[PDB]
From a paper:
DNA transfer is facilitated by a type IV secretion system (T4SS) nanomachine, embedded in the bacterial cell wall, which is extended by a long hollow filament, known as the conjugation, mating, or sex pilus. Functionally, the pilus is involved in mating pair formation (MPF), linking donors and recipients at a distance. Structures of mating or conjugation pili from the IncF and IncW incompatibility plasmids have revealed that the pilins polymerize into a helical arrangement with tightly bound phospholipid molecules, forming thin, tubular filaments ~8 nanometers in diameter that can extend several micrometers in length. Conjugation pilins are composed of three α helices, α1-3.
Using a derivative of the reference IncHI1 plasmid, R27, a tetracycline resistance plasmid isolated from [name] enterica serovar Typhi, we determined the cryo-EM structure of the H-pilus at 2.2 Å resolution. We processed data using standard helical reconstruction in cryoSPARC and reconstructed a map of the H-pilus at 2.2 Å resolution (map:map FSC, 0.143 threshold), by imposing helical (rise 12.14 Å, twist 28.98°) and C5 symmetries. The assembled pilus structure displays an outer diameter of ~ 90 Å and a lumen diameter of ~ 22 Å, which is similar to previously reported conjugation pilus structures. Like other pilins, the [name] pilin is composed of three α-helices: α1 (Gly8-Thr19), α2 (Ala21-Phe37), and α3 (Gly45-Phe66), connected by short loops. Uniquely, we found that unlike the F and W pilin structures, [name] is cyclic, formed by a covalent bond connecting the peptide backbone between the N and C termini. The density map unambiguously demonstrated the formation of a peptide bond between Gly1 and Asp69. Although the mature [name] pilin consists of 74 amino acids, only density for the first 69 residues was visible in the maps, indicating that the five C-terminal residues were cleaved during the cyclization process. The formation of a cyclic structure between N and C termini brings the α1-2 and α3 helical regions closer, likely contributing to the reduced kink angle. In the cyclization region, the main chain atoms of Gly1 and Asp69 participate in a hydrogen bonding network involving Lys24 and ordered water molecules, further stabilizing their structure. Our analysis revealed clear phospholipid density in the map, indicating a precise 1:1 stoichiometry between pilus subunits and phospholipids.
Residue numbers in the entry: 1 to 69
Amino acid sequence: GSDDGAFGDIWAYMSEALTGAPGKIIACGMLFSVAYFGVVKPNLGLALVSALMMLVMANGEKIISSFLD
Ligand SMILES: CCCCCCCCCCCCCCCC(=O)OC[C@H](COP(=O)(O)OC[C@@H](O)CO)OC(=O)CCCCCCCCCCCCCCC
């Protein structure tokens, strides 16, 4: 597809926000959630899943651009 047009600025902002502060705030929430839910049930496996989710977020722009040309 085309990255420009009437909605190019919205797409540019949203794609950058995935690895920017809005994406980092969500990623920080995953770590806080893992720590909090580990108080009663310590489960470091969820921390691994959270990291894999951050890896997906880091690759979100590439994944979207590959499917949607
Ligand atoms: C980044 C660091 C390298 C990653 C290292 C670890 C990766 C985690 C795998 C093992 C964790 C084991 C302990 C888990 C602890 C645990 O209990 O996890 C629970 C969590 C939920 O799993 P289920 O939905 O099977 O289980 C439902 C309940 O178990 C919820 O607790 O498991 C996963 O999400 C991990 C499996 C996904 C692993 C395969 C994902 C690949 C598909 C996605 C690929 C990307 C698609 C992108 C689309 C845009």
